[PDB]
Ligand binder design. Sequence first.
Ligand SMILES: *[B]([O])([O])[C]([C]C1=[C]C(C([O])=O)=[C][C]=[C]1)[N]S(=O)(=O)[C]C1=[C][C]=[C][C]=[C]1
Length: 358
Amino acid sequence: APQQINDIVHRTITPLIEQQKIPGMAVAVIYQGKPYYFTWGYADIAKKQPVTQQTLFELGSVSKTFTGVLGGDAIARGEIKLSDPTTKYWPELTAKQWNGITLLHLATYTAGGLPLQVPDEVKSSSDLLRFYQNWQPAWAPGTQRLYANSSIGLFGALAVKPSGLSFEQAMQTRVFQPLKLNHTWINVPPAEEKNYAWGYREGKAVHVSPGALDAEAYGVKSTIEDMARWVQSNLKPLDINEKTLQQGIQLAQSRYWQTGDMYQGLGWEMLDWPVNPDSIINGSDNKIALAARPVKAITPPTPAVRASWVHKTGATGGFGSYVAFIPEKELGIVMLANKNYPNPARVDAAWQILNALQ
Ligand SMILES: *[B]([O])([O])[C]([C]C1=[C]C(C([O])=O)=[C][C]=[C]1)[N]S(=O)(=O)[C]C1=[C][C]=[C][C]=[C]1
């Protein structure tokens, strides 16, 4: 890499790793459209396996960006509309609280207080139906945002129904394969297990457990190379040859709702660039990111704004990830770590790196 990229990355990430006691980390910077890679530490502490450019990390909620894009692609295919009632795709959802809840509300966490977590006891198709039928909204649709796996996770499951494909097969054939994300997985195959980092929680090696709507809300594992390619694809959707996918990427960066200085896309969240770093740094803290906040509808939604800080944090019990990019500057960053460390530390580091290069 150019020495400037080398220096800001190393000067930022070395201290981060030390302060946060991160066992292993991979970083990619995309600069004028080219990726530069950096790795530190261990994918598996016990077996002494280093982090490499091929190491798989659990993306946790950064998976929602793939879900939002796959949804976008289904809209572009004319398979679904965000204006469609949820019941169009799940007629068994007959409980009256569902009247007026659209796919848009599910995708953007505005259905009226769907919970952050699907309960552990929910597994089967019938368990899930029961859960949603019994759920009582605290608020009318399209009035408040509450970040929720049970919301965007349901969106992802319903979005692929017309296609006839399983969520995983839809994701592979419509997103992963076309973008050449050949080491990105919802289920890690046996052949790739040698590259699957362990996550670390309280010093213990852990992998994400199966759960309802896991694939849709937090299912994806990927390498730093594939995630850099994911960033490039979202930076320049027009370079993508598959028409509906190019369009789907654009739809996922549209601005649907505003709370404070942030706008809600499909999976992605966006702020105007230049961003106030305290606005995104403090904003990333779960204290704000996970809170109930009233939203203003953007009517109609603003198409992807190039002058944006577009980002998503993600975590599982053992991993912490962050992706941010600025389309107008052809600039972006991916940070993958096998410890779930605080969001504001992630955003602070990313801002320090991108600000310096911008
Ligand atoms: B995501 O990374 O924004 C999301 C947030 C979340 C946290 C928790 C929690 O604290 O238990 C529960 C649900 C959602 N994370 S996640 O979609 O990858 C789900 C998950 C969290 C922790 C461990 C495994 C899975």
